[PDB]
Enzyme design. Structure first.
Site, PDB file in Angstrom:
ATOM      1  N   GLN A 259     -70.408 -43.249 -36.011  1.00 13.76           N
ATOM      2  CA  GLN A 259     -70.251 -41.816 -35.822  1.00 13.76           C
ATOM      3  C   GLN A 259     -69.980 -41.411 -34.380  1.00 13.76           C
ATOM      4  O   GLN A 259     -69.549 -40.277 -34.149  1.00 13.76           O
ATOM      5  CB  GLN A 259     -71.500 -41.082 -36.328  1.00 13.76           C
ATOM      6  CG  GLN A 259     -71.586 -41.009 -37.841  1.00 13.76           C
ATOM      7  CD  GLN A 259     -72.475 -42.087 -38.424  1.00 13.76           C
ATOM      8  OE1 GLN A 259     -73.290 -42.682 -37.721  1.00 13.76           O
ATOM      9  NE2 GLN A 259     -72.315 -42.352 -39.715  1.00 13.76           N
TER      10      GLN A 259
ATOM     11  N   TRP B 201     -69.194 -32.777 -42.866  1.00  9.46           N
ATOM     12  CA  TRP B 201     -70.459 -32.797 -43.599  1.00  9.46           C
ATOM     13  C   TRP B 201     -70.792 -34.187 -44.130  1.00  9.46           C
ATOM     14  O   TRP B 201     -71.941 -34.631 -44.048  1.00  9.46           O
ATOM     15  CB  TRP B 201     -70.435 -31.800 -44.758  1.00  9.46           C
ATOM     16  CG  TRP B 201     -71.694 -31.832 -45.569  1.00  9.46           C
ATOM     17  CD1 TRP B 201     -72.814 -31.083 -45.372  1.00  9.46           C
ATOM     18  CD2 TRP B 201     -71.968 -32.676 -46.694  1.00  9.46           C
ATOM     19  NE1 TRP B 201     -73.767 -31.402 -46.308  1.00  9.46           N
ATOM     20  CE2 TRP B 201     -73.273 -32.379 -47.130  1.00  9.46           C
ATOM     21  CE3 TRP B 201     -71.235 -33.653 -47.375  1.00  9.46           C
ATOM     22  CZ2 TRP B 201     -73.860 -33.020 -48.218  1.00  9.46           C
ATOM     23  CZ3 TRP B 201     -71.820 -34.290 -48.451  1.00  9.46           C
ATOM     24  CH2 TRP B 201     -73.119 -33.970 -48.862  1.00  9.46           C
ATOM     25  N   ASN B 202     -69.795 -34.879 -44.672  1.00 12.47           N
ATOM     26  CA  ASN B 202     -69.939 -36.286 -45.032  1.00 12.47           C
ATOM     27  C   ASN B 202     -69.918 -37.108 -43.752  1.00 12.47           C
ATOM     28  O   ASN B 202     -68.855 -37.401 -43.202  1.00 12.47           O
ATOM     29  CB  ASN B 202     -68.827 -36.709 -45.984  1.00 12.47           C
ATOM     30  CG  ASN B 202     -69.162 -37.974 -46.748  1.00 12.47           C
ATOM     31  OD1 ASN B 202     -69.985 -38.776 -46.314  1.00 12.47           O
ATOM     32  ND2 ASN B 202     -68.520 -38.157 -47.894  1.00 12.47           N
ATOM     33  N   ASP B 203     -71.102 -37.485 -43.267  1.00 16.26           N
ATOM     34  CA  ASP B 203     -71.219 -38.190 -41.997  1.00 16.26           C
ATOM     35  C   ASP B 203     -70.674 -39.611 -42.046  1.00 16.26           C
ATOM     36  O   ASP B 203     -70.550 -40.241 -40.991  1.00 16.26           O
ATOM     37  CB  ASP B 203     -72.678 -38.221 -41.549  1.00 16.26           C
ATOM     38  CG  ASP B 203     -72.941 -37.328 -40.353  1.00 16.26           C
ATOM     39  OD1 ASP B 203     -72.182 -36.357 -40.154  1.00 16.26           O
ATOM     40  OD2 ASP B 203     -73.906 -37.600 -39.610  1.00 16.26           O
ATOM     41  N   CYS B 204     -70.357 -40.131 -43.228  1.00 16.90           N
ATOM     42  CA  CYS B 204     -69.880 -41.499 -43.371  1.00 16.90           C
ATOM     43  C   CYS B 204     -68.369 -41.593 -43.527  1.00 16.90           C
ATOM     44  O   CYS B 204     -67.851 -42.695 -43.725  1.00 16.90           O
ATOM     45  CB  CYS B 204     -70.563 -42.168 -44.565  1.00 16.90           C
ATOM     46  SG  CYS B 204     -72.217 -42.781 -44.214  1.00 16.90           S
TER      47      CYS B 204
END
Lengths: 810, 810
Positions: free
Chosen positions: B499, B481-484
């Site tokens: 990513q 969920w935290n794309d970073c």
């Protein structure tokens, strides 16, 4: 109408009115740092890559046009103005812009205060220097404020203009002394930064765009300039900028000097920080100290002048026509060198987002710039060949930055391999350096499969030899030189590319343009074969050339002009049987340079038809009649409104081919009249109609079927410059490089009494004087070299670093 | 500071000053035609695709901001102004902007002339209608002229903004009557066009931008408006525009009414032309006739009002707090529906160039709008399942336009398959329609490989089971969920995606967030398994869930809070042993929601630590301490300056999860105080600090470590609205859809005396009145339905289309 004049002594164009029909720009930089600057000091700078290392921010197609750049504000007791008349746009007592070779001067006066700024990129320097003179020409002492302003870019123009959801929070700056450092993303993965510096103590600074200008204010009236002082803002995200503010006291007649530098610094990954969170500024300190006085800037300016003089000194013409002298001696060569430096990266019509140049474009530019930079031309030729595929095919797009070919775009543009042979032959004829043919060039950038360069030329020849069609003519494939003639596309979907999408196998559609190109370049290929000692290979190549010529004469001539192509259905293109596009311009020129139809009168008939059907007061149109609807079997050419781009527009690129053909048939007056219609110096007095820069070539001029007939588009990034320089200097003036030396064969208007050309060729200088006692157009009667009569028309090679006098009688 | 107020009776936000901290926008359109409009009438329109069918042009990140839109000019005896105060920016006697549900009304007056414009897109109409009222409130008769102006786009925003080398010669228009038609590339593979029309006789028109405005003039003062007359220009390339000009006589107290329409027409390929070169305007004719009078426009306006009223009618709250009433009743549901309509395509921070939305984003958004549009939610879920791959993984990016997954971005975001189960369970709880589980859904959009929806849920569940790590925790892939948080990237080169680039295999880095997800979402999967009759499958799933819970308790708890992840080296992330990032926010939110440590006090300790280390007056930060350098082993999270985006910024999206966890532990006061810090209605009085729209949620607010602490970014398009609505309406107010019915379990501040909620649920309406005699936070004492006491906390289902009274005492 005219908006300025030429300064031939200083090699400048002087714009005397700020409101030109369009922004007129210039290029600064030679090696790695490049700048586009307009006549109102608008534009932007970048480091080697307008797409991936852009330094300053510029908005294309803006309202108002050309909004953003190096902006200086002069503030005087509540009034304020700009030296370039932009962005403030208040009336100036005097305005002037001077576009020189690698530099731009802008002078503006108001209220007795005069400001002169010189912008240029010095040699071996990753920065742009702006030298500012502020002079008080009034009768009273003044207290004024000087404001500088540039807007930074986030190093990725596409990301800078699309990815706000991340990059509105990444902008970072540093302020130290009189230097503002842009270091966005320097903390994570970038080892480079930019800076804006001045060499004097400042009264204030600004680095936040919303603080310097204001949210609802434009460039014309920033809130800080209106208030008369800076806000000393430190940027935190959003839009970083750089602005110095200096308070100046001027006595009557007293002036002051300042040096502003926009610089780029790359650091080693180990030595990236001076301390935790503080960047390393040693290289920036050295760069700033390099030009901390006006004397050093003047020295660099003189060195740049010497550099450009040496670049342009290799071809000098002395004629009775000052427009011709200014075109040949200064601006054509300057544009050719600029095209070599910039490729097709960035202009006011190219957004700088593209990924590379065209393979044919790279090969054709060499024909223009070969005589100025032979060694860089040799390196470029060797780099181009390494990308060629094993079967002789080539990548359509070349990337000079990475020295690679674009795999995504691909291949199947069937005219590409012949341009390599043409460029290699041109280099060999210019330098005499046959050793390039014995170098080991890889295939597809694969050192394992490496062969000689002559092998690359052989593959290029036999790619066309193998891919022939039903009539014996070359298969056009995806396209030919005309990128909009897509005979294998048949596209009905609005968003698919016309040049990459194919729905036909490509085994029917032919091209007589590629056939004429094959016949033209096979002569050079056979000469190269004979040099290497391969007599049987030369015989085979000559047989193939003769077969192609017979095929052209049998299935390529419409009856009064050469055909254009055969579509996938097998029907003729560019024929009198068609209701539209009865004649095209591309086939006639290349089929006449190949000496096809010179004895039976076919070439003369084709050129007469070109004059009858394609001639306008502004040049030759591509085809006639213009396509009034969409032809799914033709591709993108009919997707343009009539009179624009490939739909019967004027391409000055293929007008040079008609000029060469007219010289081939011996009609020098017609060739020179064709040359005059598109030459920038001859159309200056009609600038308001041309609307573009009156000192450089443009790609395309609106045709007769258009209601903007005479208006140009896509300036400064053209193969027009190289081909028109070749046509004027080698086919008309008759100084042509050749395998054995220098060939003299002019084709000039009859009224000319003569001329002379000073040519540097293979380590020597020739002073060729041509005179026309009996007023003719073509035909050499006598050549004397160093006072002795010679035989033939090829000058001997000396290579002794001396000057020899050549006298030519027609 | 405050820049407006709320009109709850009229369901509007009223902006009373034009100079607002940032342009505040609104969305018009419901099905296919969409438009963004700001408080100064700036923005643009498009048809179903901000990237491939953009109708009007807008410049992002402009100077001045928000230049371009539907611009009306009033010219009066040499003076001129704009009703929206922009772009002329001349002072107005009165200004007002009302942002409503699907409409925007802008009123401005000057010199006794008042202009009121209402913009809205009607239902089942491919156009935007602007109804203009011009009233003379002075004491003398006046002679004015009204100018309209929009700027067209060439249907491809990327091509429009990057490909000037071709599109400067393609612009085409027609003018007939009072209608201007934009038909660029209509002569070609496009079968669609746009038009701008007014229902009155015009004194003049303009369609060329350079003729209406001028090259060196801006939107603030076009030359035609300055001169008071139109130029009647027909566009030929460059920039097409549309402009009407009407001369108006006004008596004192007299008013005039006009209807402008921006419309889009699609034709059949066989009906494109009326004649050769003349487009077919019959559909445009009937479209214009549909709204040729003010009465029809008023009727359509009332119909749109009824549409939105029915949309927001399924959840009504009656409390003592008007801010809560307006947040729950109007703006949260409105934002959820707008997010469903627009996905993540176009905002003032999203440029409209993206190709789709996130796979997790659609499923998470479904949780907010499921109770408003249950029938479209079912179709959305079925499409999302159809895009899923065979092994249970999913494409990261969903494309609702083509109903496909983005193959170029790919997979290996290991939390993605888990959201499908949550969304399907939410739909089944809301509707009770278990039949969705028995539908044949394709795999990878392949109808041959089709199985039931429950099979898709099984694959999604067992993707995590088969991808565990060394500690038994789910293997994080490219990200969660935290794309970073990219623990497999290790990137040293810029301009490469954080990513999609992986330099490590990915068999070591695990995630504690996905583990809490698996425990939380897996119980719904077990319930579905029990419903389907598979008791052994439910037993196995419960065994796996228990093993996951044990793994979390053994290797996921730091000692005073939950760990975040294990990096590739195998070290703890989000641990007190680390010098930075010793505590994150997501793991605590989802591990307490799954009820992992409520009995030993671990959850209470984790929430206390969250309050102690992450709480700010403007919300909760993601992690603390903020990363001060770049951590190569962590990815993009440390690439942000401290306090911004994922580097210790405030995301309200996980603030909702913290609110839910606070309700789980039974602390309603803490949950409501967390809710208030981010709710738009409670932070309106601090608008100048928030700087964005005070009526919708934003994606991210600057954290405590930032200098701009309290400032927001990326408004109007986020999962914040859906999750915050879920948290306030289901976890705090206690009206939760559930299998077998509707559960009542509020967790409210003690001081509340009670409240009333009217809920439409499964074909019936419930009037739930909550009473708090003894001021507590959690725990219901009795529930009476229709006057009869029930057992448990699940309301019976009636499905009779009637209203039932529910009395709840805590």
């Amino acid at each position: 109408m005219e908006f300025g004049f030429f300064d031939d002594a200083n090699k400048e164009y002087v714009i005397t009115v700020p409101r030109t029909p369009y922004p007129w720009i210039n290029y600064l930089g030679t090696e790695n740092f490049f700048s586009l600057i307009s006549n109102t000091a608008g534009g932007y700078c970048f480091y080697r890559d307008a797409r991936l290392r852009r330094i300053t921010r510029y908005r294309y197609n803006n309202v108002p046009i050309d909004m953003g750049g190096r902006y200086f504000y002069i503030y005087d007791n509540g009034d304020f103005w700009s030296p370039g008349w932009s962005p403030v746009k208040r009336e100036l007592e005097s305005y002037e812009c001077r576009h020189g070779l690698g530099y731009t001067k802008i002078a503006g006066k108001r209220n007795g205060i005069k400001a002169e700024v010189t912008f240029f990129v010095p040699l071996n320097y990753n920065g742009e220097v702006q030298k500012l003179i502020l002079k008080n020409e009034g009768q009273d002492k003044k207290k004024i404020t000087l404001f500088s302003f540039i807007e930074f870019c986030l190093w990725n123009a596409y990301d800078d203009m699309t990815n706000f959801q991340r990059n509105f929070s990444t902008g970072e700056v540093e302020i130290e002394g009189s230097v503002i450092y842009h270091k966005t993303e320097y903390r994570e993965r970038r080892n480079h930064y930019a800076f804006y510096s001045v060499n004097a103590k400042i009264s204030g600074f600004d680095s936040d765009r919303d603080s310097f200008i204001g949210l609802y204010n434009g460039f014309d009236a920033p809130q800080a300039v209106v208030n008369g002082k800076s806000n000393n803002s430190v940027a935190d995200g959003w839009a970083p900028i750089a602005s110095h503010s200096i308070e100046i006291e001027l006595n009557p007649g007293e002036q002051k000097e300042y040096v502003f530098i926009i610089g780029y610094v790359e650091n080693k990954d180990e030595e990236k920080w001076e301390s935790k969170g503080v960047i390393n500024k040693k290289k920036a300190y050295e760069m700033i100290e390099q030009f901390n006085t006006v004397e050093k800037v003047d020295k660099a300016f003189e060195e740049l002048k010497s550099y450009w003089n040496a670049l342009l000194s290799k071809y000098f013409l002395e004629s009775h026509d000052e427009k011709l002298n200014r075109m040949v001696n200064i601006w054509n060569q300057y544009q050719c060198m600029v095209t070599f430096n910039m490729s097709r990266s960035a202009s006011y019509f190219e957004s700088g987002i593209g990924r590379g140049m065209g393979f044919r474009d790279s090969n054709q530019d060499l024909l223009g710039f070969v005589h100025q930079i032979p060694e860089r031309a040799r390196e470029r030729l060797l780099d181009l060949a390494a990308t060629q595929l094993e079967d002789g095919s080539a990548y359509h797009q070349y990337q000079p930055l990475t020295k690679k070919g674009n795999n995504e775009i691909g291949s199947n543009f069937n005219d590409d391999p012949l341009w390599l042979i043409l460029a290699t032959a041109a280099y060999i004829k210019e330098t005499g350096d046959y050793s390039i043919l014995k170098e080991q060039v890889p295939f597809n950038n694969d050192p394992s499969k490496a062969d000689t360069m002559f092998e690359h030329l052989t593959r290029s020849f036999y790619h066309v030899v193998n891919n022939l069609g039903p009539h014996g003519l070359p298969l056009i494939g995806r396209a030919d030189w005309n990128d909009c003639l897509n005979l294998n596309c048949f596209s009905t979907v609005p968003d698919e590319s016309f040049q990459t999408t194919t729905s036909k196998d490509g085994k029917v559609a032919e091209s007589v343009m590629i056939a004429g190109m094959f016949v033209f370049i096979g002569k050079d290929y056979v000469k190269l074969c004979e040099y290497m000692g391969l007599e049987e290979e030369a015989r085979k190549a000559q047989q193939h050339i003769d077969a192609m010529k017979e095929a052209i004469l049998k299935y390529g001539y419409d009856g009064e002009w050469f055909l254009r192509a055969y579509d996938d259905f097998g029907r003729k293109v560019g024929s009198k049987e068609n209701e539209e596009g009865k004649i095209f311009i591309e086939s006639q020129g290349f089929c006449v340079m190949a000496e096809i139809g010179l004895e039976d009168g076919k070439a003369l008939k084709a050129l007469d038809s070109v004059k009858k059907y394609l001639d306008t007061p502004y040049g030759l149109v591509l085809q006639n009649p213009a396509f009034t609807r969409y032809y799914i079997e033709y591709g993108e050419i009919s997707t343009y409104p009539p009179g624009y781009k490939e739909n019967a527009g004027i391409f000055c690129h293929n007008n040079a081919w008609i000029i060469c053909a007219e010289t081939v048939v011996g009609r020098g007056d017609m060739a020179f009249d064709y040359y005059r219609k598109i030459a920038p110096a001859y159309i200056e007095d009609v600038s308001d109609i041309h609307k573009l820069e009156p000192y450089v070539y443009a790609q395309m001029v609106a045709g007769k079927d258009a209601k903007r007939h005479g208006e140009a588009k896509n300036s400064w990034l053209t193969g027009t410059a190289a081909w028109n320089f070749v046509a004027i200097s080698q086919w008309i003036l008759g100084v042509k490089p050749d395998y054995d030396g220098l060939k003299i064969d002019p084709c000039i208007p009859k009224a000319w009494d003569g001329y002379k050309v000073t040519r540097y060729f293979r380590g020597s200088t020739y002073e060729i004087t041509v005179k026309n006692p009996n007023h003719v157009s073509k035909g050499v009667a006598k050549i004397t070299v160093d006072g002795n009569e010679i035989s033939g028309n090829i000058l001997p090679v000396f290579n002794d670093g001396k000057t020899h006098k050549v006298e030519v009688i027609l």
